Amino acid sequence: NAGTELLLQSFERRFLAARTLRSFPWQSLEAKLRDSSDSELLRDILHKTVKHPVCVKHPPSVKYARCFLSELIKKHEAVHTEPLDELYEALAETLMAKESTQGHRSYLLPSGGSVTLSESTTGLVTWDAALYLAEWAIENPAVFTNRTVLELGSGAGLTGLAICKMCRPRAYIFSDCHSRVLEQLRGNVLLNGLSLEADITAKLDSPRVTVAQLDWDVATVHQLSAFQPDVVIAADVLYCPEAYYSLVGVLRRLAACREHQRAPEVYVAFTVRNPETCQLFTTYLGRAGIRWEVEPRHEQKLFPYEEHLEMAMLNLTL
Ligand SMILES: Nc1ncnc2c1ncn2[C@@H]1O[C@H](CSCC[C@H](N)C(=O)O)[C@@H](O)[C@H]1O
Numbered sequence: 001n002a003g004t005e006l007l008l009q010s011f012e013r014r015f016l017a018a019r020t021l022r023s024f025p026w027q028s029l030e031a032k033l034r035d036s037s038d039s040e041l042l043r044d045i046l047h048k049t050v051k052h053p054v055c056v057k058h059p060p061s062v063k064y065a066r067c068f069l070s071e072l073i074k075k076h077e078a079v080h081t082e083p084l085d086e087l088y089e090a091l092a093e094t095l096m097a098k099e100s101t102q103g104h105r106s107y108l109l110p111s112g113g114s115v116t117l118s119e120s121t122t123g124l125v126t127w128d129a130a131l132y133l134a135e136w137a138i139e140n141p142a143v144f145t146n147r148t149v150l151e152l153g154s155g156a157g158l159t160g161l162a163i164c165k166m167c168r169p170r171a172y173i174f175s176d177c178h179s180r181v182l183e184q185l186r187g188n189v190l191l192n193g194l195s196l197e198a199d200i201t202a203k204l205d206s207p208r209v210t211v212a213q214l215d216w217d218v219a220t221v222h223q224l225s226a227f228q229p230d231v232v233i234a235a236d237v238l239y240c241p242e243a244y245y246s247l248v249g250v251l252r253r254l255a256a257c258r259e260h261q262r263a264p265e266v267y268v269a270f271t272v273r274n275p276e277t278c279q280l281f282t283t284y285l286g287r288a289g290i291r292w293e294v295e296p297r298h299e300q301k302l303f304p305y306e307e308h309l310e311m312a313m314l315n316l317t318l
Contacts, residue, residue, distance in 0.1 A: 007032065011049060017303070018105045021071065023306075046072075061103040132271075132298075134163065135301065136298050147170055149229065151173065154181075157185045157188050173229065176213070182211055194207070196210060212227070233266075237268065244281050248290070255318035266290075267314070281314075
């Protein structure tokens, strides 16, 4: 019984997150369909995916839906041909009507809510390290509760939206330098029901959410002072070795910004796509006077990661 529930959770989370088709656990479904002639498992998969309420409100790209339903029909055809009307009617609905419009990826939260993002086809995508950092923030809510959080390179804003909906920060500052990324970020913040600080904030439960432009290369000590962060986080921001120096300079300025009172806690998570990345970043941090420790690997529970590469996260003392 436990295997079936875990399989259903896997299918739900992987379809909602629009993960790659090859990542779906088709072999466990094959075994379960071979052991039972009951199409109710396929029906439960149907209701937890294409007919899931969060999908119904924010559907993914129609291509994804039709490929998924075609492969699910193909897996249904191998076992006893008890025709399930719901699968074919749903595929009819997907195919018969509408256009591609825009895509959506949704991520479920422990509170029963969800984070819905309208990321499109490199900052316009939700990288895995964002999922990793969001999970870590969910399992360590004391770091952010009623705190001021500044994210460097928010991208689509998955991590920040998850933190705003799970850890109750006092204020959250999404920061990026690319204009289209910031536009999609504001659209995603409004899509998830969060009102910006410029707008009149209501009831003080809503965190003061701001989407500020913050280019790492020219960010001044005054501009960074203006934010007054208690925590600074970044995820998958180590794309090129040259940007290491820009990011380290930004952290340097951030510490220097408020010489009076202490420096904020800095957490940098990244996908280890090249060990040279981590080694070079650590050497630069040591040369700049920032101390660093490796945070322990946390069990990956909620979110389905795209590539399952080795994840890492550094706690930096400024
Ligand atoms: N020099 C710079 N200054 C400010 N932001 C930068 C930057 N260089 C890259 N970025 C931003 O950093 C992001 C890295 S992609 C990571 C996005 C997000 N953290 C996620 O994991 O989904 C991009 O969105 C890009 O816009």
